[PDB]
Amino acid sequence: GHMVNPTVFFDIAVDGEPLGRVSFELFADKVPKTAENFRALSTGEKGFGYKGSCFHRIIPGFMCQGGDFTRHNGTGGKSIYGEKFEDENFILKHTGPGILSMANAGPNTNGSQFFICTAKTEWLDGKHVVFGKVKEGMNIVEAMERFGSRNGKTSKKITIADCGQLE
């Protein structure tokens, strides 16, 4: 039947202590290639992915960035496609808190890194691909946000202790 947009979860920890769960709707109807990458990295089904990775940069009143599961600092990451992949489209905009969007280093350089907005970031429209939104647990993202700083260094270690796909 009809494709149902996937739901994925992250169970977040702070210095190894459970914080709570954030779940996301992935807009596979609009950005299928991008949604699928994040979905598969969340389940780990290719043999690599987000489980155990950290949020390396958190700037309160802006965004939380993660997904660098290879180098843990924003210098690494890889997609499920064997290479960075293209910007699918820019249909969806950075409208406010909870938007899930791809990090990149130029046109057509999507890997695994992503960010969760904690504010409207409209200046990123048209250059970062929006592919999902927080469904439940925006309060958990707001709690994470408190451990960021102006320059984005976190004051506690913020990890994805577990992640996967929901019904």
Ligand SMILES: C[C@@H]1NC(=O)[C@H](CCCN)NC(=O)C2(/C=C/c3ccc4ccc(nc4c3)[C@@H](C)NC(=O)[C@@H]3CCCN(N3)C1=O)COCOC2
């Ligand atoms: C611009 C950045 N890109 C990267 O982090 C990439 C990842 C490349 C992995 N191979 N990495 C990159 O683009 C490079 C580094 C970017 C960098 C490093 C530290 C930063 C500290 C703060 C900020 N931006 C920063 C950007 C603020 C202004 N913006 C952001 O943090 C945005 C918010 C939206 C998501 N995002 N970062 C990115 O996509 C390193 O690789 C070559 O181009 C620049």
Ligand SMILES: [Cl-]
């Ligand atoms: Cl990446």
